[PDB]
């Protein structure tokens, strides 16, 4: 419960290129004069009235001690939705009269939530120290940066709340929640898709959903009078690495849009194995075998750090890798190669170790070990004794022969 959110009003005029000015949002004014802020421009100091209560409730339970949320304000002019699927929300060309006045779009991002609000300032000398603004549409998500294992489901959260603005004595509409549109798109690496489009409360043809995705798009109730809360949760059945990136969710009402963005990251922990596993060969000097360390089926490809150790010490020997090998599931495999120097008696029982640090892995990483065998004073086996006897017998027989 900050009770105040510092915000950056971003100029929209072409002449001023993304200029920024200080402002504040006063979620809870409380009985009495609001805190004086002579440093702020009067129009950018807002006291927020939320009949729906979504914006208030979002920060009422905000974690203590967390960094202040990043807020940005901008001026908003209602426009009809340009997407063709959302064409039934505004059948008539005439702009609604109830949407007259000034509008502010507020975007508040944080590690715990991402929120967007449409506010209506009141022009309202003496009370100029504060500007009263009422919330109209709020769209928030509590999963602004989901992490999903490869092959698992994603449940991108989305909630919204809508209180219709003052009708200006023009509220001759059907009692009950108004129909709305829900849009879910993806953007990543210069590639965008309309994953899902819905218009709950209105019957029409929507573009087919992609990747078998569905949404819980509905009003939470059908009461005749607002405010109304609603759900827009996104369910992505199986998450492959090609579905990573930015997911944009938009709620559409006639001439009103509310957008939030999420960052979906896909991961898969590597499987590490040191291919030479039969200990090693003799070490009378020189002739060391080359050790291969295979890390298989890990995503993302980048960020993997392979290190060689002697068992703890920094292993010695030439080191290199191999170009990434890409699997059908989208993961990648890598091979490290170590060529140790001439092994001798001093390395008897010492293990060459390959250790992998990856973002998906724990802080310790994953390790593989190969023991370095050396030549010692091993006694002859029974088969060796039999072979010695047979060789001596054959040699003495040959000596007798010649």
């Amino acid at each position: 419960g900050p009770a105040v959110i510092e915000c950056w009003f971003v100029e929209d005029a072409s002449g001023k290129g993304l200029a920024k000015r200080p402002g504040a949002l006063l979620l809870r004014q409380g009985p009495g004069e609001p805190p004086p802020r002579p440093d702020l421009d009067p129009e950018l100091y807002l006291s927020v009235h939320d009949p729906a209560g979504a914006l208030q409730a979002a920060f009422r339970r905000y974690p203590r001690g967390a960094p202040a949320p990043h807020c940005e304000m901008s001026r908003f002019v209602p426009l009809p939705a340009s997407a063709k699927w959302a064409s039934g929300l505004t059948p008539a060309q005439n702009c609604p009269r109830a949407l007259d006045g000034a509008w502010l779009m507020v975007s508040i991002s944080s590690p715990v939530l991402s929120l967007s609000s449409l506010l209506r300032p009141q022009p309202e000398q003496e009370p100029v120290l504060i500007t009263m603004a009422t919330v109209v549409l709020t769209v928030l998500t509590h999963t602004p940066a989901p992490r999903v294992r490869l092959g698992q489901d994603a449940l991108l959260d989305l909630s919204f709340a809508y209180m219709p603005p003052t009708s200006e004595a023009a509220s001759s509409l059907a009692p009950g929640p108004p129909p709305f549109g829900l849009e879910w798109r993806r953007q990543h690496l210069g590639k965008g898709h309309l994953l899902l489009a819905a218009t709950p409360g209105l019957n029409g043809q929507m573009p087919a959903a992609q990747e078998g995705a569905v949404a819980f798009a509905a009003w939470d109730d059908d009461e005749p009078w607002g405010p109304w809360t609603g759900n827009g949760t996104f369910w992505l059945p199986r998450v492959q690495p090609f579905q990573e990136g930015t997911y944009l969710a938009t709620i559409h009402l006639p001439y009103l849009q509310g957008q939030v963005t999420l960052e979906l990251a896909v991961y898969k922990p590597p499987k590490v194995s040191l291919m030479p596993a039969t200990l090693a060969r003799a070490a009378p000097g020189e002739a060391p075998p080359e050790l291969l360390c295979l890390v298989s089926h890990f995503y993302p490809s980048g960020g993997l750090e392979v290190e060689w150790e002697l068992r703890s010490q920094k292993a010695e020997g030439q080191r290199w890798l191999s170009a990434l090998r890409h699997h059908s599931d989208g993961s990648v495999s890598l091979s490290g190669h170590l060529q140790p120097p001439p092994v001798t008696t001093e390395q008897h029982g010492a293990r060459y170790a390959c250790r992998i640090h990856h973002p998906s892995l724990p802080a310790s990483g994953r390790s593989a070990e190969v023991t370095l065998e050396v030549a010692g004073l091993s006694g002859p086996s029974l088969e060796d004794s039999v072979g010695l006897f047979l060789s001596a017998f054959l040699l003495l027989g040959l000596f007798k022969a010649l």
């Binding site: 426009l79 340009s82 963005t261």
Partner: protein
């Protein structure tokens, strides 16, 4: 098959080393045919393909002036975005714009692109419907709303469905001897014993154009997609491409496996055995 024409603009800021460097390139099927570079000794729009060299000097002077104006605009946008994002002026940041048209084998428009990126991340893009825009942050949404008010998407749709496709067809005709060719791949299998009880079969495809190709490994007609390693398609350096696919198999069982190769230049898909 499918063809495309793309134009890339890239402005890279160099604090303390002069004004941002600006590069503009035009590609047909990933082959460049025109280039500009502010670092170049002569700031001119230089053709770099044999199938565009027959055009007149006016087509080059006009482009050079257009690209100088684009360089100034991109430098201004770089400064504005660095200011907005609250980043140090001693760092290096890049602004990229791409626009073009992807046309199918029938010569009819399939897709039209008009995208921007800042520091390698999507900034604002035109959607597949050529009507709306995708913008994530507030700075991009301001431009989105300005463009929607001004109805720039209509002009971009008119251009992409018009001049872009016409020029793509003209290029594909004037340079069909290399743009519309189809070199089949040369293929062979290689055997490498990894351990005493496992081998690796590597299927090669060399010297093929275009780059689009499909390599698969099958065991008695069943795909082995999960257990199949792949190297990305790479340029041989002489206008053709290389690729290979590797499958690990039990020692002794190297005859049931088959490599299936699909490419345009091949009249029929190829089946290869060790």
């Amino acid at each position: 098959g499918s063809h495309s024409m793309r134009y890339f603009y890239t402005s890279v800021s160099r604090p303390g080393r002069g004004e941002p460097r600006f590069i503009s390139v035009g590609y047909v099927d990933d082959t460049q045919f025109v280039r500009f570079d502010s670092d170049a000794a002569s700031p001119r729009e230089e053709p770099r393909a044999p199938w565009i060299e027959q055009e007149g000097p006016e087509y080059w002077d006009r482009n050079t002036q257009i690209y100088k104006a684009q360089a100034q605009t991109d430098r201004e946008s770089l400064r504005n975005l660095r200011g907005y994002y609250n980043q140090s002026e001693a760092g290096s940041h890049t602004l990229q714009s791409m626009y073009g048209c992807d046309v199918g084998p029938d010569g009819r428009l399939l897709r039209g692109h008009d995208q921007y990126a800042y520091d390698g991340k999507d900034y604002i893009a035109l959607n597949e419907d050529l009507r709306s825009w995708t913008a994530a942050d507030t700075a991009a949404q301001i431009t989105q709303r300005k463009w929607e008010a001004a109805r720039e998407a209509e002009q971009r749709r008119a251009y992409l469905e018009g001049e872009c496709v016409e020029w793509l067809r003209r290029y594909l005709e004037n340079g069909k001897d290399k743009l519309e060719r189809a070199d089949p791949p040369k293929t062979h299998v290689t055997h490498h014993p990894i351990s005493d009880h496992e081998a690796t079969l590597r299927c090669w495809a060399l010297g093929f154009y275009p780059a689009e190709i499909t390599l698969t490994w099958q065991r008695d007609g069943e795909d082995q997609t999960q257990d199949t390693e792949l190297v990305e398609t790479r340029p041989a350096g002489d206008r053709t491409f290389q690729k290979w696919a590797a499958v690990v198999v039990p020692s002794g069982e190297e005859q049931r496996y088959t490599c299936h190769v699909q490419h345009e230049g091949l009249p029929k898909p190829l089946t290869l055995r060790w």
